[PDB]
């Protein structure tokens, strides 16, 4: 167990999805010689948001992976209405931010590394029934230069028993640039759509996060940047059904363009399992070293 009057803050990592991340020094000797860890509260702790970080908090507990960030643990101390979710510190930041400081100095190799890293992680996931919803290079983070871990299990749902989807009724913030063609019409999230979101995640990755690259900015161009509001959920779901897609990244190899415009199929059972996705990127870093 964790003590809140032992951790002591250090400093703010971000926002998640419904909290913020901070890094704190867990220090029971007072001695500053504690573990630095990260810990994810929430802003409004109110009975709807306790019970999703709740779940998200037993989600990860059950999680065992080299590229899933470890759960340490949980603080209770501020009582059962105030949990904070203790979280191993990974020093490198985000694979987003990452990326964006180091630019083109991390070469297609690295890329493909951390590629075939974030396919195993999901397919782990996968194996669980959990559908991650929110796959992104924001919510992906670096251990150090040679591993990354899936993070921001905040959105992640698990699937019913006898159904391949979860169908979200009431949807909160959703990262729509990032969304399978279904998820967008009927808010429904499976396998496969988290597939669709890794298609867009190995297009960060190549695109390097050049700013006027990102998904959001190239598929507001695709449907015209005059859309706004509800307007451009619409005019997404008819581009991408008349199979308007993000661009292959300027020196992405054709191979990889061509796992990623595979993972962007309208058809959700012709997209490639995460099974299929680690072996054929292994195949290729192979091809390659
Ligand atoms: C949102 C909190 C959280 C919840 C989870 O369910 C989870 F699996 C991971 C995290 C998380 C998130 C961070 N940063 C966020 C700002 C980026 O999304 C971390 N940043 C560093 N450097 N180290 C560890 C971090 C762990």
């Known amino acids: 167990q964790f003590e809140e ?44 948001h306790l019970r999703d970080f709740e779940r998200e908090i037993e989600i990860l507990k059950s999680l065992q992976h080299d590229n899933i960030v470890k759960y340490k643990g949980v603080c209770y101390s501020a009582g059962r209405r105030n949990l904070k979710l203790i979280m191993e510190y990974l020093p490198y930041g985000s694979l987003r931010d990452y ?10 190799i690295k890329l493909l590394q951390y590629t075939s890293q974030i396919c195993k992680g999901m397919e782990y996931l996968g194996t669980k029934r959990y559908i991650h919803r929110d796959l992104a290079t924001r919510n992906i983070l670096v251990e150090n230069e040679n591993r990354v871990k899936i993070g921001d299990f905040g959105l992640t749902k698990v699937l019913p028993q006898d159904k391949e989807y979860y169908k979200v009724k009431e949807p909160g913030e959703s990262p729509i640039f990032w969304y399978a063609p279904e998820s967008l ?23 390097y996060i050049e700013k006027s690259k990102s998904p959001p900015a190239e598929f507001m161009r695709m449907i015209g940047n005059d859309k706004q509001g509800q307007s451009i959920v619409t005019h997404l779901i008819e581009l991408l059904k ?42 290729i870093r192979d091809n390659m070293a």
């Open 242 to 283: 008349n199979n308007g897609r993000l661009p292959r990244p300027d020196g992405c190899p054709d191979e990889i363009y061509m796992i990623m415009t595979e993972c962007w199929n309208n058809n959700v059972n012709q997209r490639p399992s995460f099974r299929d996705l680690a072996l054929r990127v292994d195949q």
């Open 99 to 108: 990326l964006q400081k180091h630019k083109e100095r991390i070469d297609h």
């Open 185 to 207: 019409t009927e808010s429904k999230f499976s396998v496969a759509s988290d597939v669709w979101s890794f298609g867009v995640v190995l297009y960060e990755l190549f695109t």
């Open 5 to 48: 009057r032992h951790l002591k803050f250090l400093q703010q990592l971000g926002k998640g999805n419904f909290g913020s991340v901070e890094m704190c020094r867990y220090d029971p000797l007072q001695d500053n010689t504690g573990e630095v860890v990260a810990v994810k509260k929430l802003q409004h702790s109110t009975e709807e």
